[PDB]
Design a protein around this ligand. Sequence first.
Ligand SMILES: NC[C@@H]1O[C@H](O[C@H]2[C@@H](O)[C@H](O[C@@H]3[C@@H](O)[C@H](N)C[C@H](N)[C@H]3O[C@H]3O[C@H](CO)[C@@H](O)[C@H](O)[C@H]3N)O[C@@H]2CO)[C@H](N)[C@@H](O)[C@@H]1O
Ligand SMILES: [Mg+2]
Ligand SMILES: [Mg+2]
Ligand SMILES: [Mg+2]
Ligand SMILES: [Mg+2]
Ligand SMILES: [Mg+2]
Ligand SMILES: [Mg+2]
Ligand SMILES: [Mg+2]
Ligand SMILES: [Mg+2]
Ligand SMILES: [Mg+2]
Ligand SMILES: [Mg+2]
Ligand SMILES: [Mg+2]
Ligand SMILES: [Mg+2]
Ligand SMILES: [Mg+2]
Ligand SMILES: [Mg+2]
Ligand SMILES: [Mg+2]
Ligand SMILES: [Mg+2]
Ligand SMILES: [Mg+2]
Ligand SMILES: [Mg+2]
Ligand SMILES: [Mg+2]
Ligand SMILES: [Mg+2]
Ligand SMILES: [Mg+2]
Ligand SMILES: [Mg+2]
Ligand SMILES: [Mg+2]
Ligand SMILES: [Mg+2]
Ligand SMILES: [Mg+2]
Ligand SMILES: [Mg+2]
Ligand SMILES: [Mg+2]
Ligand SMILES: [Mg+2]
Ligand SMILES: [Mg+2]
Ligand SMILES: [Mg+2]
Ligand SMILES: [Mg+2]
Ligand SMILES: [Mg+2]
Ligand SMILES: [Mg+2]
Ligand SMILES: [Mg+2]
Ligand SMILES: [Mg+2]
Ligand SMILES: [Mg+2]
Ligand SMILES: [Mg+2]
Ligand SMILES: [Mg+2]
Ligand SMILES: [Mg+2]
Ligand SMILES: [Mg+2]
Ligand SMILES: [Mg+2]
Ligand SMILES: [Mg+2]
Ligand SMILES: [Mg+2]
Ligand SMILES: [Mg+2]
Ligand SMILES: [Mg+2]
Ligand SMILES: [Mg+2]
Ligand SMILES: [Mg+2]
Ligand SMILES: [Mg+2]
Ligand SMILES: [Mg+2]
Ligand SMILES: [Mg+2]
Ligand SMILES: [Mg+2]
Ligand SMILES: [Mg+2]
Ligand SMILES: [Mg+2]
Ligand SMILES: [Mg+2]
Ligand SMILES: [Mg+2]
Ligand SMILES: [Mg+2]
Ligand SMILES: [Mg+2]
Ligand SMILES: [Mg+2]
Ligand SMILES: [Mg+2]
Ligand SMILES: [Mg+2]
Ligand SMILES: [Mg+2]
Ligand SMILES: [Mg+2]
Ligand SMILES: [Mg+2]
Ligand SMILES: [Mg+2]
Ligand SMILES: [Mg+2]
Ligand SMILES: [Mg+2]
Ligand SMILES: [Mg+2]
Ligand SMILES: [Mg+2]
Ligand SMILES: [Mg+2]
Ligand SMILES: [Mg+2]
Ligand SMILES: [Mg+2]
Ligand SMILES: [Mg+2]
Ligand SMILES: [Mg+2]
Ligand SMILES: [Mg+2]
Ligand SMILES: [Mg+2]
Ligand SMILES: [Mg+2]
Ligand SMILES: [Mg+2]
Ligand SMILES: [Mg+2]
Ligand SMILES: [Mg+2]
Ligand SMILES: [Mg+2]
Ligand SMILES: [Mg+2]
Ligand SMILES: [Mg+2]
Ligand SMILES: [Mg+2]
Ligand SMILES: [Mg+2]
Ligand SMILES: [Mg+2]
Ligand SMILES: [Mg+2]
Ligand SMILES: [Mg+2]
Ligand SMILES: [Mg+2]
Ligand SMILES: [Mg+2]
Ligand SMILES: [Mg+2]
Ligand SMILES: [Mg+2]
Ligand SMILES: [Mg+2]
Ligand SMILES: [Mg+2]
Ligand SMILES: [Mg+2]
Ligand SMILES: [Mg+2]
Ligand SMILES: [Mg+2]
Ligand SMILES: [Mg+2]
Ligand SMILES: [Mg+2]
Ligand SMILES: [Mg+2]
Ligand SMILES: [Mg+2]
Ligand SMILES: [Mg+2]
Ligand SMILES: [Mg+2]
Ligand SMILES: [Mg+2]
Ligand SMILES: [Mg+2]
Ligand SMILES: [Mg+2]
Ligand SMILES: [Mg+2]
Ligand SMILES: [Mg+2]
Ligand SMILES: [Mg+2]
Ligand SMILES: [Mg+2]
Ligand SMILES: [Mg+2]
Ligand SMILES: [Mg+2]
Ligand SMILES: [Mg+2]
Ligand SMILES: [Mg+2]
Ligand SMILES: [Mg+2]
Ligand SMILES: [Mg+2]
Ligand SMILES: [Mg+2]
Ligand SMILES: [Mg+2]
Ligand SMILES: [Mg+2]
Ligand SMILES: [Mg+2]
Ligand SMILES: [Mg+2]
Ligand SMILES: [Mg+2]
Ligand SMILES: [Mg+2]
Ligand SMILES: [Mg+2]
Ligand SMILES: [Mg+2]
Ligand SMILES: [Mg+2]
Ligand SMILES: [Mg+2]
Ligand SMILES: [Mg+2]
Ligand SMILES: [Mg+2]
Ligand SMILES: [Mg+2]
Ligand SMILES: [Mg+2]
Ligand SMILES: [Mg+2]
Ligand SMILES: [Mg+2]
Ligand SMILES: [Mg+2]
Ligand SMILES: [Mg+2]
Ligand SMILES: [Mg+2]
Ligand SMILES: [Mg+2]
Ligand SMILES: [Mg+2]
Ligand SMILES: [Mg+2]
Ligand SMILES: [Mg+2]
Ligand SMILES: [Mg+2]
Ligand SMILES: [Mg+2]
Ligand SMILES: [Mg+2]
Ligand SMILES: [Mg+2]
Ligand SMILES: [Mg+2]
Ligand SMILES: [Mg+2]
Ligand SMILES: [Mg+2]
Ligand SMILES: [Mg+2]
Ligand SMILES: [Mg+2]
Ligand SMILES: [Mg+2]
Ligand SMILES: [Mg+2]
Ligand SMILES: [Mg+2]
Ligand SMILES: [Mg+2]
Ligand SMILES: [Mg+2]
Ligand SMILES: [Mg+2]
Ligand SMILES: [Mg+2]
Lengths: 45, 272
Amino acid sequence: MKRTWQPNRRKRAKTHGFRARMRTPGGRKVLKRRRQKGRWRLTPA
Amino acid sequence: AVKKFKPYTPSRRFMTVADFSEITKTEPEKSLVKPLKKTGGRNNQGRITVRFRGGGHKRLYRIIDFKRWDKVGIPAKVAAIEYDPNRSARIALLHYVDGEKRYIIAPDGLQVGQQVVAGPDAPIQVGNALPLRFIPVGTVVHAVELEPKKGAKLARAAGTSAQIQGREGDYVILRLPSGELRKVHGECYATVGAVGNADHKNIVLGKAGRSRWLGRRPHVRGAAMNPVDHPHGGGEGRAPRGRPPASPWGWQTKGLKTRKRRKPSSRFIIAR
RNA sequence: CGCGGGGUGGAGCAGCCCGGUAGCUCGUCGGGCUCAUAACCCGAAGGUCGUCGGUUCAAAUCCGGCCCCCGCAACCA
RNA sequence: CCUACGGGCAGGCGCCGAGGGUAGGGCCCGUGACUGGGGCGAAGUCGUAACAAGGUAGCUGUACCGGAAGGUGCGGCUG
RNA sequence: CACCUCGAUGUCGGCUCGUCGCAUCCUGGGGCUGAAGAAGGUCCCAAGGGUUGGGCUGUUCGCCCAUUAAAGCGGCACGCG
RNA sequence: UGCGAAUGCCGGCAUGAGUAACGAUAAAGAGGGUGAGAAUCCCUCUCGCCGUAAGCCCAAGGGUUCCUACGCAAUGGUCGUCAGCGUAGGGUUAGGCGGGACCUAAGGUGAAGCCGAAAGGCGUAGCCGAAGGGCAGCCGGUUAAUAUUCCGGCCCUUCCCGCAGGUGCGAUGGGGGGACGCUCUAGGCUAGGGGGACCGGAGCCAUGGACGAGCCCGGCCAGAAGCGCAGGGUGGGAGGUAGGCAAAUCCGCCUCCCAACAAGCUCUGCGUGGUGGGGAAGCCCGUACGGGUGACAACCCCCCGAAGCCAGGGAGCCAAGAAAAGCCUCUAAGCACAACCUGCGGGAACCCGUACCGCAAACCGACACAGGUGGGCGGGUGCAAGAGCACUCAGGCGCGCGGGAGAACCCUCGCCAAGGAACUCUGCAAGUUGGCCCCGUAACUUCGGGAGAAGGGGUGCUCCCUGGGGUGAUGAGCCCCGGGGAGCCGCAGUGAACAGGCUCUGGCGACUGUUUACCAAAAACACAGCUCUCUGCGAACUCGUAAGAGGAGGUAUAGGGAGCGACGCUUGCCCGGUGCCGGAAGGUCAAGGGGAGGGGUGCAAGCCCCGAACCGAAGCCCCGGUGAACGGCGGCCGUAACUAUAACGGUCCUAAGGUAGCGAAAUUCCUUGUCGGGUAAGUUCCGACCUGCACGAAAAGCGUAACGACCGGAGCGCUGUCUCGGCGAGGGACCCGGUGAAAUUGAACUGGCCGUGAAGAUGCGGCCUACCCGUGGCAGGACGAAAAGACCCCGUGGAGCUUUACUGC
RNA sequence: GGCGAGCUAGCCCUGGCCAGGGUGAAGCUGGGGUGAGACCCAGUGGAGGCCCGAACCGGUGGGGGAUGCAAACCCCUCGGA
RNA sequence: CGUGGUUCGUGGAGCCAUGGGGGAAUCUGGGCGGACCACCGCCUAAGGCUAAGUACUCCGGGUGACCGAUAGCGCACCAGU
Ligand SMILES: NC[C@@H]1O[C@H](O[C@H]2[C@@H](O)[C@H](O[C@@H]3[C@@H](O)[C@H](N)C[C@H](N)[C@H]3O[C@H]3O[C@H](CO)[C@@H](O)[C@H](O)[C@H]3N)O[C@@H]2CO)[C@H](N)[C@@H](O)[C@@H]1O
Ligand SMILES: [Mg+2]
Ligand SMILES: [Mg+2]
Ligand SMILES: [Mg+2]
Ligand SMILES: [Mg+2]
Ligand SMILES: [Mg+2]
Ligand SMILES: [Mg+2]
Ligand SMILES: [Mg+2]
Ligand SMILES: [Mg+2]
Ligand SMILES: [Mg+2]
Ligand SMILES: [Mg+2]
Ligand SMILES: [Mg+2]
Ligand SMILES: [Mg+2]
Ligand SMILES: [Mg+2]
Ligand SMILES: [Mg+2]
Ligand SMILES: [Mg+2]
Ligand SMILES: [Mg+2]
Ligand SMILES: [Mg+2]
Ligand SMILES: [Mg+2]
Ligand SMILES: [Mg+2]
Ligand SMILES: [Mg+2]
Ligand SMILES: [Mg+2]
Ligand SMILES: [Mg+2]
Ligand SMILES: [Mg+2]
Ligand SMILES: [Mg+2]
Ligand SMILES: [Mg+2]
Ligand SMILES: [Mg+2]
Ligand SMILES: [Mg+2]
Ligand SMILES: [Mg+2]
Ligand SMILES: [Mg+2]
Ligand SMILES: [Mg+2]
Ligand SMILES: [Mg+2]
Ligand SMILES: [Mg+2]
Ligand SMILES: [Mg+2]
Ligand SMILES: [Mg+2]
Ligand SMILES: [Mg+2]
Ligand SMILES: [Mg+2]
Ligand SMILES: [Mg+2]
Ligand SMILES: [Mg+2]
Ligand SMILES: [Mg+2]
Ligand SMILES: [Mg+2]
Ligand SMILES: [Mg+2]
Ligand SMILES: [Mg+2]
Ligand SMILES: [Mg+2]
Ligand SMILES: [Mg+2]
Ligand SMILES: [Mg+2]
Ligand SMILES: [Mg+2]
Ligand SMILES: [Mg+2]
Ligand SMILES: [Mg+2]
Ligand SMILES: [Mg+2]
Ligand SMILES: [Mg+2]
Ligand SMILES: [Mg+2]
Ligand SMILES: [Mg+2]
Ligand SMILES: [Mg+2]
Ligand SMILES: [Mg+2]
Ligand SMILES: [Mg+2]
Ligand SMILES: [Mg+2]
Ligand SMILES: [Mg+2]
Ligand SMILES: [Mg+2]
Ligand SMILES: [Mg+2]
Ligand SMILES: [Mg+2]
Ligand SMILES: [Mg+2]
Ligand SMILES: [Mg+2]
Ligand SMILES: [Mg+2]
Ligand SMILES: [Mg+2]
Ligand SMILES: [Mg+2]
Ligand SMILES: [Mg+2]
Ligand SMILES: [Mg+2]
Ligand SMILES: [Mg+2]
Ligand SMILES: [Mg+2]
Ligand SMILES: [Mg+2]
Ligand SMILES: [Mg+2]
Ligand SMILES: [Mg+2]
Ligand SMILES: [Mg+2]
Ligand SMILES: [Mg+2]
Ligand SMILES: [Mg+2]
Ligand SMILES: [Mg+2]
Ligand SMILES: [Mg+2]
Ligand SMILES: [Mg+2]
Ligand SMILES: [Mg+2]
Ligand SMILES: [Mg+2]
Ligand SMILES: [Mg+2]
Ligand SMILES: [Mg+2]
Ligand SMILES: [Mg+2]
Ligand SMILES: [Mg+2]
Ligand SMILES: [Mg+2]
Ligand SMILES: [Mg+2]
Ligand SMILES: [Mg+2]
Ligand SMILES: [Mg+2]
Ligand SMILES: [Mg+2]
Ligand SMILES: [Mg+2]
Ligand SMILES: [Mg+2]
Ligand SMILES: [Mg+2]
Ligand SMILES: [Mg+2]
Ligand SMILES: [Mg+2]
Ligand SMILES: [Mg+2]
Ligand SMILES: [Mg+2]
Ligand SMILES: [Mg+2]
Ligand SMILES: [Mg+2]
Ligand SMILES: [Mg+2]
Ligand SMILES: [Mg+2]
Ligand SMILES: [Mg+2]
Ligand SMILES: [Mg+2]
Ligand SMILES: [Mg+2]
Ligand SMILES: [Mg+2]
Ligand SMILES: [Mg+2]
Ligand SMILES: [Mg+2]
Ligand SMILES: [Mg+2]
Ligand SMILES: [Mg+2]
Ligand SMILES: [Mg+2]
Ligand SMILES: [Mg+2]
Ligand SMILES: [Mg+2]
Ligand SMILES: [Mg+2]
Ligand SMILES: [Mg+2]
Ligand SMILES: [Mg+2]
Ligand SMILES: [Mg+2]
Ligand SMILES: [Mg+2]
Ligand SMILES: [Mg+2]
Ligand SMILES: [Mg+2]
Ligand SMILES: [Mg+2]
Ligand SMILES: [Mg+2]
Ligand SMILES: [Mg+2]
Ligand SMILES: [Mg+2]
Ligand SMILES: [Mg+2]
Ligand SMILES: [Mg+2]
Ligand SMILES: [Mg+2]
Ligand SMILES: [Mg+2]
Ligand SMILES: [Mg+2]
Ligand SMILES: [Mg+2]
Ligand SMILES: [Mg+2]
Ligand SMILES: [Mg+2]
Ligand SMILES: [Mg+2]
Ligand SMILES: [Mg+2]
Ligand SMILES: [Mg+2]
Ligand SMILES: [Mg+2]
Ligand SMILES: [Mg+2]
Ligand SMILES: [Mg+2]
Ligand SMILES: [Mg+2]
Ligand SMILES: [Mg+2]
Ligand SMILES: [Mg+2]
Ligand SMILES: [Mg+2]
Ligand SMILES: [Mg+2]
Ligand SMILES: [Mg+2]
Ligand SMILES: [Mg+2]
Ligand SMILES: [Mg+2]
Ligand SMILES: [Mg+2]
Ligand SMILES: [Mg+2]
Ligand SMILES: [Mg+2]
Ligand SMILES: [Mg+2]
Ligand SMILES: [Mg+2]
Ligand SMILES: [Mg+2]
Ligand SMILES: [Mg+2]
Ligand SMILES: [Mg+2]
Ligand SMILES: [Mg+2]
Ligand SMILES: [Mg+2]
Ligand SMILES: [Mg+2]
């Protein structure tokens, strides 16, 4: 029955995307973090 | 003067609708002078700040005219009386000789045909806006201004009036629909007559649904909540208030007065 | 079994707290007014205070046991 | 089968049909825990409404109230 | 009373399947009788086997209806999830 | 720095075990081929299953899964030569299809501006934002794999430039327009489908008959201009003009004059059309798919016909139904050797997607998971209709372990003599009933209902006669609705499939609705409606530190809070306490004002400190009001000419002592109260009494038609629920081949009884019994498994909740 | 201090969907009716949180499932439509 | 008056800072030495700049009674995979 993943490409980028992580200071930090740990991916694809 | 239905379905039984005879040919409520897209929206920026709202028919705002002094001395003929869904009252469409068209909140009386005028001049007959200092004592008048040039704000709901009981200083004394006794400035534009479509008080929605068409969602009694969400929520099978009855936010809701006292406007009031 | 209150002329209640006075209304008895009754007025009578103890100089009153009356509780299971 | 056969009788099917069954109505009678008023029955209880301004003139339609008669409001009549 | 069990011993009633005891409800054998016969009373032996169908209530129990030779009382983690 | 325990951590390997399972009971069988190997790959034939799908096209999502060659270690629940798997190579073509060099929507962002300790929050215009608006391609063929994309045919839009002809041209600005709901719905058409005796077509005559107006197959598709057909759109001229934030010659408005019609003009739809292309059965080829022929195919009449199109059509209704651009008109700067408009001609026309899966083995569910997933198409026949049901077309499937066997037992099914709720907590379950037409139908009622009440009859086929409609002509055909009559057959004609059991009577809730996603669907919530209360509008109220916003572009016939809950009849008494409301007096009271009076130090001037009276708010006190505000609404004793009983009285208390109505109740402890009813029997049910442990009037009181997957009682019908079981079917269980888990597990060589033992012993004691080891079965025991008991206590453990607990904000 | 409304709840903008049958409100027309009316009766008409019933939305009772096909499923039955 | 800082938690509570209120002087002026006064002294507020000694280790070197693949950084290995 309707599970919790209902992937939709526009929402995923609108929500977790790069351009979005960067307006909220709280997320510019998510990037700062992810970059420091050396995540090969700063954001979802 | 209000339509009744045989009970061919429960709710149709007691249900009762408006009379739309005053409505001179209408439907297409004329674009130009209104409509204007209306923003149905039940909360402010984010959060619900008036409870139990939303849903209900889509709506087109009729941009109605509340300052009437805008067109002193220019008369106008009255072309339509039509259904406005954003007020208890019905609205008169009036063609000016100026060429200009706008809407007015339709007084009890205006037949489709009258010339209507506004200004210190102007004959005292239903539909004509004057300043208040020039309207003769004892006249019922409506769509009143509270301070000169600020727009009509008093007595504009179907059937509401306001008698002018006296004059004193640059001010006149009205009885507003609330029974209150208020001094209003003399220069404030009022417009002679009562508001009309006055049976509106007597409609009976009839079923739950009708209350939603109207845009009002179900309203749940504190009584029926838990104590987390309302100062009346608990017991174990219906337990009296058990305190002086209260609103979700805590303040007492039976009797406790609310008007800010220091208000400047106090020095211009006198009743209930 | 638990807790609290109570028992006072015939009825219903004070007095018990703070030791030493027994009081109120009704009723009962005698006498008036009335043709008569009632109402009304004038007079009087009647209690050992549930009981056994104990304290005190002295106990309705302070203490304890027993006898009754009424009320409250008896929950997790 | 009989004949005096292009016949009759037996026999067969059919309509109607007393009544039997199933179903649901109507009307009347009897009866029933209990309950409502009513009549009647020498000397039971409570008050005093009415009859004499009945000691608050009476009566009256209505309405509310009250152990009970009754009282009260509104209007009416005069008996 | 608080002894094993709170790093779990699932609690009433029914149903199913029983098994045991005897302080015997019936049937078998008896003594005594205020036992004429018939039918009973009371006590003794006896556990082979039997010990009904319904109404009410979740009930066990009990009341009741119709019968019956009788419509037994208990134990088994108030036998048995 | 030494391990055996920490339900320790990490890893390895065991037990259960060749055990359960191998994922829908739509179903398989044989021949042939390939290969080391074949139930599992290919092919043929036969069988079965989907067909409002289990077929087909689109959108999401997915991301090489597409196509071909080669291959099988692993993935595939078996096998595997096969594959969505491995390796490699190929494959996605657009001015017109979708999106972008267009528009705006909620919302976002945001010059100006506002606010906030910083971070930041708001915000006019603007900008961004789409499945909405705007916008030009239809059809056939070709590829192993793409196609409205390549090709072919016919058709079209925009930009640039030029030539002609026309005009005051010109816009981010003005106006028109775009531009709009729901239900019903006219006409004409189209998609779609059926029939034909007509036109085309390979063949076919079996098995008793048929060479026949036989059978079987097919009889269209796209298409400019013109033209028909249907429908939408719309008045024309003149003057005045102060409104549409400049200006208009435009629009608005006033007068007047002409048509009032679609006449005219315009637009779309359908038809026809040049041209283009398709084109079955069957037979042959060879598939792993398709190709040849049929053929020079034919290509036509009739009927049924949308929910689609003409479209902005029409009527009714109340809840009263986006924006902006494209478009057109108007003008302003500006320019008018410009520019625009029209026609023609040349040229120019960019970016992204396009494979494939897409109700699923390619998406969301760890899985090739019986679950979930939006739009469109969805044929035929019958059944009254229909997207229902049965069968079926096209198309797609037999669900990736099999073979046998024919036990118990389990699941899903069918049937049962007599009985018929006797079962049980309860008719749970299952049965009965069941579509359509006709007859018929009660109490009660708010007059609509109750109603499918109830209870009944009819239902197939054949022949004869016969009425009306649509289409054609008024006719035949064809399609539709019937009416009457004589017959035939079976156990039975809605002959299969989909298709209510019913009545009586209480409780609660008026009603449709809503709810604890995943143990509660309810008598709970909501609900129209009633009442109280607040709020005069920069409203109250809510969110926010603010700005601001919601309320509301509302205004007391409105908005907030609270209770009650359709409707009928009603809703009593207490304001002493608490709440709120009112009260210009008085009492108290903080800072502050005020300083009489005192003190510290100085030689002194001074400097500095304490401080009475008195003037100083709200709050509280105090005075009053208020009950659809929180709330409350008595005790003893006596009394009548049998007796009981008490209308009457006495007395104590109170703020006042419960009115109407109701009452063993969703409330009654005693209690299975008592009486009546129902039953052979009634702790329940119904009626009644009142002794109300502990009913009672907006946490409403008492009723109420209708309504209910609520809950209680009773009856009829019918039954495997039962007396009481039996038989039968299929899927498992069993055996054989292939693959092969799990909780659990100190170690085991793991018996009964009677004892004992930490009080319930395979493990101690005595006695008894007992050859070793499996398999199918049953669940009494291993205080069997699971979960560090949820109950209970304990911890100066936690957390949600409350208030006249404390203390704060 | 940050991350979440791609599940779920509410609201906002914009689209879409609901076979087929039944019942027959107003209004309208006609007839009766009256001084005029109310009203009556036909026909027409097509209203409704109206009825039956698929899609679709549900989740009533029961059975099965319970190391499942499934960390909520399956079958029969049932509610709205 | 309200608070912060200092060892200072209103304490006899100064000093330094300052949200609010009132509000000077310029050497004979001002601040300070722990309520306040005197005396005796210290120091020049309301403007500013200033190397070094000091902190740290992404990074480079050198050492080790530091680890030796369950250790040692999570990663000795194409791991923030
Ligand atoms: N029969 C009279 C009717 O009913 C009522 O009358 C009845 C009663 O009111 C009346 O009762 C009366 C009473 O009022 C009066 N004040 C006392 C008197 N003793 C009683 O009377 C009764 O008493 C005894 C019993 O002991 C009987 O034997 C006697 O017959 C009977 N009348 O007795 C009547 C019936 O017996 C009304 N009074 C009257 O309005 C009406 O007309
Ligand atoms: Mg869904
Ligand atoms: Mg994921
Ligand atoms: Mg997941
Ligand atoms: Mg999207
Ligand atoms: Mg890298
Ligand atoms: Mg409510
Ligand atoms: Mg609750
Ligand atoms: Mg919360
Ligand atoms: Mg909250
Ligand atoms: Mg609270
Ligand atoms: Mg409460
Ligand atoms: Mg309660
Ligand atoms: Mg006494
Ligand atoms: Mg006396
Ligand atoms: Mg005397
Ligand atoms: Mg004594
Ligand atoms: Mg408790
Ligand atoms: Mg009587
Ligand atoms: Mg009198
Ligand atoms: Mg008298
Ligand atoms: Mg009198
Ligand atoms: Mg009277
Ligand atoms: Mg009395
Ligand atoms: Mg009078
Ligand atoms: Mg113990
Ligand atoms: Mg002990
Ligand atoms: Mg254990
Ligand atoms: Mg014996
Ligand atoms: Mg029973
Ligand atoms: Mg036994
Ligand atoms: Mg016991
Ligand atoms: Mg037991
Ligand atoms: Mg070890
Ligand atoms: Mg050890
Ligand atoms: Mg070890
Ligand atoms: Mg390994
Ligand atoms: Mg085994
Ligand atoms: Mg087995
Ligand atoms: Mg097996
Ligand atoms: Mg399978
Ligand atoms: Mg396909
Ligand atoms: Mg791949
Ligand atoms: Mg191959
Ligand atoms: Mg392999
Ligand atoms: Mg394999
Ligand atoms: Mg598998
Ligand atoms: Mg492939
Ligand atoms: Mg491959
Ligand atoms: Mg496409
Ligand atoms: Mg460009
Ligand atoms: Mg834009
Ligand atoms: Mg912002
Ligand atoms: Mg854009
Ligand atoms: Mg579009
Ligand atoms: Mg396009
Ligand atoms: Mg093609
Ligand atoms: Mg393809
Ligand atoms: Mg022009
Ligand atoms: Mg066609
Ligand atoms: Mg056709
Ligand atoms: Mg030929
Ligand atoms: Mg032959
Ligand atoms: Mg021939
Ligand atoms: Mg055809
Ligand atoms: Mg004109
Ligand atoms: Mg055409
Ligand atoms: Mg054409
Ligand atoms: Mg051709
Ligand atoms: Mg094939
Ligand atoms: Mg229209
Ligand atoms: Mg724009
Ligand atoms: Mg142009
Ligand atoms: Mg493609
Ligand atoms: Mg494709
Ligand atoms: Mg496909
Ligand atoms: Mg689909
Ligand atoms: Mg697939
Ligand atoms: Mg498919
Ligand atoms: Mg999957
Ligand atoms: Mg599979
Ligand atoms: Mg699946
Ligand atoms: Mg049918
Ligand atoms: Mg079907
Ligand atoms: Mg089939
Ligand atoms: Mg096929
Ligand atoms: Mg039978
Ligand atoms: Mg039979
Ligand atoms: Mg029967
Ligand atoms: Mg029974
Ligand atoms: Mg029984
Ligand atoms: Mg049933
Ligand atoms: Mg059935
Ligand atoms: Mg009924
Ligand atoms: Mg037929
Ligand atoms: Mg036949
Ligand atoms: Mg014809
Ligand atoms: Mg039915
Ligand atoms: Mg139904
Ligand atoms: Mg309900
Ligand atoms: Mg739900
Ligand atoms: Mg639930
Ligand atoms: Mg505002
Ligand atoms: Mg607004
Ligand atoms: Mg309520
Ligand atoms: Mg009351
Ligand atoms: Mg009070
Ligand atoms: Mg008071
Ligand atoms: Mg009070
Ligand atoms: Mg007598
Ligand atoms: Mg009670
Ligand atoms: Mg009886
Ligand atoms: Mg019960
Ligand atoms: Mg009471
Ligand atoms: Mg109550
Ligand atoms: Mg109340
Ligand atoms: Mg109620
Ligand atoms: Mg009731
Ligand atoms: Mg319902
Ligand atoms: Mg229900
Ligand atoms: Mg059976
Ligand atoms: Mg053995
Ligand atoms: Mg033992
Ligand atoms: Mg030993
Ligand atoms: Mg032993
Ligand atoms: Mg065994
Ligand atoms: Mg066992
Ligand atoms: Mg077993
Ligand atoms: Mg255990
Ligand atoms: Mg524990
Ligand atoms: Mg604590
Ligand atoms: Mg959401
Ligand atoms: Mg559909
Ligand atoms: Mg409905
Ligand atoms: Mg219904
Ligand atoms: Mg269910
Ligand atoms: Mg449920
Ligand atoms: Mg279930
Ligand atoms: Mg179940
Ligand atoms: Mg059904
Ligand atoms: Mg259904
Ligand atoms: Mg339905
Ligand atoms: Mg301190
Ligand atoms: Mg300062
Ligand atoms: Mg100095
Ligand atoms: Mg110093
Ligand atoms: Mg000093
Ligand atoms: Mg110094
Ligand atoms: Mg300086
Ligand atoms: Mg520096
Ligand atoms: Mg280093
Ligand atoms: Mg290693
Ligand atoms: Mg390591
Ligand atoms: Mg490092
Ligand atoms: Mg590691
Ligand atoms: Mg690496």
